[PDB]
Amino acid sequence: DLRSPICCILGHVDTGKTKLLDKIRQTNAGGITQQIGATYFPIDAIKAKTKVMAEYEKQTFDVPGLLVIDTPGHESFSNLRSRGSSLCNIAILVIDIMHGLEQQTIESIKLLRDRKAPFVVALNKIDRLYDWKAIPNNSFRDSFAKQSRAVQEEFQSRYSKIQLELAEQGLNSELYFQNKNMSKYVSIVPTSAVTGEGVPDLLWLLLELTQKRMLSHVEATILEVKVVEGFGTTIDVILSNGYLREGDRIVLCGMNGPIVTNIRALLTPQPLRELRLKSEYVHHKEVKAALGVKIAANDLEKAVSGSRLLVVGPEDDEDELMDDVMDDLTGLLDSVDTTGKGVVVQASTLGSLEALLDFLKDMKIPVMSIGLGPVYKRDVMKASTMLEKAPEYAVMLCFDVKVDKEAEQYAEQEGIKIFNADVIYHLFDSFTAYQEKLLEERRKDFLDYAIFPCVLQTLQIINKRGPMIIGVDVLEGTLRVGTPICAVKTDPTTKERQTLILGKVISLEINHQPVQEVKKGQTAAGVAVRLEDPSGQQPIWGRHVDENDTLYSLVSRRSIDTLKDKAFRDQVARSDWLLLKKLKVVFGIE
């Protein structure tokens, strides 16, 4: 009697996903089990629910029952174990028949098609068919055969459209009973959360997709880390294999290293509604696989949601298991830049983190460090070290995490942008938008400060002042409008150095035409350079500067730095960096 299949149902509220789950549960007598963080369906109840399916299909019951996890968050969290551990044996994707594929549904598809996780689609809301005549809790095929051609038409249209919209997302799909290959195809089960129609179909199909196509070792997964009034910090877990017994020495991933503890309590909620003030929850000496269960213990405070859970055995070495649970994150931790400029990243679950990191890897946003849970001054201090080196990356990319008042108030002192939202977009738009806004400010400052190299030979002086106009040959580089031109003169002995700024280029004329720029080689003509007077006495031609003095764009330490950022991406040539090299020699810049 091996372990129950695990089913994750996810959908947006609008789709009716929560109403569907409620209708699935349907209490009205041992009772349906409302286990902590999951609902348990005993095979008996399943047979009872699916009796009506006998009309259409072979019924098989090779499993003890079924485990369903309602939450989209915990579907994110069931995706938190993710690639390393698959949490659900299958997913039930809910879509509104009236509305077709909606933004979120698109995402959920991509998400499932990422973990390679198998899924079925509940085409919900069929009760809203315009002339639908309801047969509560019936199988879909039976209700459908009893519907009018008007409804048969409407259904075919909406269905085959949604089928189409799915095709557009990469999915071949079919009504479940009509699919030649379950693989490389997606089953579609019409349902109504209102009348319960089609639920029987869905229940059947889950058993069929799990029992054949899909133990001593203990498989446990941390769904949630919660402070309980009488127990301090607890972990809510889903147990897929084996037993948990009170006193059991467990290991789990913590945000400050591997955590080892002993099970003080195994708790589930209380069957009596009346019992549960005095009773609270029930305590168990031991519990078997296929259930969702709260563990009380010491040292859980920094437990990481999404962690695998291990029971240390007689022959097992503790220190090697301490190694094992941490492995999922360790893989994640090693990817990061460490001592390299990058944005800091923080998340709620192991999966939320993996997802975010994977997404950023594809953008190619570098990542200095990663973290989990509540954001503190400690964590935002990691980002601090990027204010001078790479200010754009002076930001935290947080997903689904509370931030401290102290830490947010602290991130206000410095210039730390904290990004915090449920989905990437908000970060991606804020982050991307912030990065562009930063360039917007950077560009305005940079253009004045920035300066390309050029070396000019004066051919002859056209106008000595008012304004100075020089006829030149560009020897090296790019002479452009805005560029400040200067002479470098060393008194033979006394002065040992100099800078004589003649002006900034107003306009450039070659061959009777305005030009905005002249690169070495562009012409042979010689170019008249009109120079805007600099502030403070312009050197005097003949007296101070003359035909023989090679003149160059005025470059400086500041000039050179401003080239490196914002300017650098496309504008500079290698020839121009090489010229800069030589200019520093002339200007005495290190």
């Binding site: 050179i560 650098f568 960096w577 090299k581 520093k584 290190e590």
Partner: peptide, 11 residues
């Protein structure tokens, strides 16, 4: 003229 090779971190 001996076109390579130089960095951008040195200066």
């Amino acid at each position: 003229g001996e076109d390579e090779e130089l960095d951008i971190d040195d200066i």
